[PDB]
Design an enzyme around this catalytic site. Sequence first.
Site, mmCIF file in Angstrom:
data_model
loop_
_atom_site.group_PDB
_atom_site.id
_atom_site.type_symbol
_atom_site.label_atom_id
_atom_site.label_comp_id
_atom_site.label_asym_id
_atom_site.label_seq_id
_atom_site.Cartn_x
_atom_site.Cartn_y
_atom_site.Cartn_z
ATOM 1 N N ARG B 55 0.867 -1.225 0.098
ATOM 2 C CA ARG B 55 0.159 0.100 0.087
ATOM 3 C C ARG B 55 0.918 1.329 -0.146
ATOM 4 N NH1 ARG B 55 -2.807 2.350 5.354
ATOM 5 N NH2 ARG B 55 -4.633 3.395 4.329
ATOM 6 N N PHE B 60 1.389 10.696 1.273
ATOM 7 C CA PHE B 60 0.816 10.214 2.609
ATOM 8 C C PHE B 60 2.142 9.282 2.968
ATOM 9 C CE2 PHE B 60 -2.129 7.362 4.933
ATOM 10 C CZ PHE B 60 -1.515 8.030 6.310
ATOM 11 N N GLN B 63 3.409 1.592 2.776
ATOM 12 C CA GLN B 63 3.206 0.700 3.824
ATOM 13 C C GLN B 63 3.807 -0.719 3.167
ATOM 14 O OE1 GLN B 63 -0.423 0.997 5.464
ATOM 15 N NE2 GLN B 63 -0.378 -1.151 6.361
ATOM 16 N N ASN B 102 -1.005 -0.456 12.131
ATOM 17 C CA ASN B 102 -1.861 -1.362 13.224
ATOM 18 C C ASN B 102 -3.223 -1.150 12.822
ATOM 19 O OD1 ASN B 102 -3.189 0.774 14.799
ATOM 20 N ND2 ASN B 102 -1.061 1.412 15.431
ATOM 21 N N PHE B 113 5.102 1.715 8.017
ATOM 22 C CA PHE B 113 4.984 2.506 7.195
ATOM 23 C C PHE B 113 6.079 3.615 7.327
ATOM 24 C CE2 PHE B 113 2.644 6.273 9.318
ATOM 25 C CZ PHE B 113 2.305 5.530 10.475
ATOM 26 N N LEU B 122 -1.862 11.208 12.876
ATOM 27 C CA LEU B 122 -1.444 9.844 13.382
ATOM 28 C C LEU B 122 -0.618 9.714 14.866
ATOM 29 C CD1 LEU B 122 0.079 8.578 9.890
ATOM 30 C CD2 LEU B 122 -2.150 8.388 11.247
ATOM 31 N N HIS B 126 -0.041 5.575 16.113
ATOM 32 C CA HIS B 126 0.898 4.800 15.796
ATOM 33 C C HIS B 126 2.318 4.967 16.225
ATOM 34 C CE1 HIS B 126 -1.755 3.294 12.359
ATOM 35 N NE2 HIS B 126 -2.390 4.658 12.657
#
Lengths: 146, 165
Positions: B55, B60, B63, B102, B113, B122, B126
């Site tokens: 991903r 952004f 991942q 997660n 990521f 975030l 995370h």
Amino acid sequence: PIVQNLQGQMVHQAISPRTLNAWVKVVEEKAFSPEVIPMFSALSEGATPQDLNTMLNTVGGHQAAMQMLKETINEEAAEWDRTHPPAMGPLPPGQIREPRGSDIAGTTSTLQEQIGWMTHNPPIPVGEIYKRWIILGLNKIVRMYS
Amino acid sequence: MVNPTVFFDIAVDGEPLGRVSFELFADKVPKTAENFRALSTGEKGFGYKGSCFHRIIPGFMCQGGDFTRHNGTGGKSIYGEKFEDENFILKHTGPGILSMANAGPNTNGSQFFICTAKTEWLDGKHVVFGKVKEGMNIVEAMERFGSRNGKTSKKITIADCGQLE
């Protein structure tokens, strides 16, 4: 509720006291008779989970029923959770957190949240999901009492 | 050194793209650091070598780390199952921050990521545990393979990885 704005895009409106009052009167008249079920659905068109909660929470009396309904709901939520593994984060910019079972039933979600899910493109239909759970609980109540 | 250094050699449909190295913050999040460290060396018998970044969302983050199912549904930590959020001291302050993916609180496995922008939203969710040291440009090149929904246009793999320093 979330209502179709005739100029496009779905919009939220405050819960309607009239709709509410008509549900409350259905309930005082018919004491968990089978016709309550379609009436519930007829008066909960575009309802948010908070709206549905308000509708159910205002029914004076019938505490045993209301608490049996809660249990069907809380059961259905737990099951939904057990059948839908949480999506992996991290959450992308502009996205709202995905709803769990407790979010759909409106017990751990805000109205803002529920608004955002139901008005998202495409809608994430927390009101319709919840409504099915509630109908299942109503079935159980109508079978107990009728 | 208290903080280890690990490297990933990244490939695109099998062709080498380059090296990205990371400082791991064992001095702030030792358990999380040692998990990634160990997964990067393959010392337990399993880990990142050969896995993919499944991903990538441009602007952004990139991942990866699902080395058991390759799609975001797997991964495993060296602890024998998911592990707790160690702390949230370190913030997602900008491109190059390395942080644990997660599925909710206390569910750290092996998925991680690499941020390509500041990702404030975030923080508290995370666990940040490292940063890119060399090769940020390689991470930026990886974003060229992503899309808004994270699906990648080409197979982005860690063709090799281990520890440096």
